[PDB]
Design a protein around this nucleic acid. Structure first.
Lengths: 71, 71
DNA sequence: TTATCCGCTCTACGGGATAA
DNA sequence: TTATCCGCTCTACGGGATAA
C-alpha cells in the first residue's frame, strides 16, 4: 500500500485489490447496495465519484484508509 | 492518524489538520484554485463531495493517503 | 473568517437494461 | 463479467457575493 495522490491512482489501487481477491464488480455491488455500473464508473472515471461511493466500495473490499504526510 | 471509514470521519480529520496548522479555508482554496465555499461544504457535508475536491484539499493540507486493512 | 445565498451547467447515481 | 446505454432527479461546483 503506497501513498495515493489522485482519484485515478486511488481507483487503480482499489481495482487491483478487487482483482487480486478474485472479486467481481457485481459481488461487491450487491454486498453494499450499490449498482455494478457505479463501480465500473468509479474504476474507469473516478474524478467525480462521491466520497460515499468511495467508502462503500472500501468496505466491500474489506479495506480502510488513513491520512499521512505528502512527504 | 487513525483508520477512517466514512466521509464524515474523513472531513472531521482533515478539518482538524487545518485547524492545528492555523490555516483558513481561503488560504487552502486559493492554493489549489478551488472556491472557499467548496471547502466549507466538504467539511460540513462531505457525503457527496467528489474525489477530485478531496485530493485537492489533501494537497493543500500537505497530506496524502494510503489504503489499509479494515481490521 | 466561514457559513450561506443566487442562478448556471454537468454529471453521478439510482431505476431500468444489454452484448458477447 | 463488465462496459455502456436510457431517462430521471439531485446536487456539486464553478461564477457571483454577504453578514457580522
Amino acid at each position: 500500500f503506497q501513498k495515493i495522490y489522485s482519484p485515478t491512482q486511488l481507483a487503480n489501487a482499489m481495482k487491483l485489490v478487487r482483482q487480486q481477491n478474485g472479486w467481481t464488480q457485481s459481488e461487491l455491488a450487491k454486498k453494499i447496495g450499490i449498482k455494478q455500473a457505479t463501480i465500473s464508473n468509479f474504476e474507469n472515471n473516478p474524478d467525480n465519484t462521491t466520497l460515499t461511493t468511495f467508502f462503500k466500495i472500501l468496505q466491500s473490499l474489506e479495506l480502510s484508509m488513513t491520512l499521512c504526510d505528502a512527504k
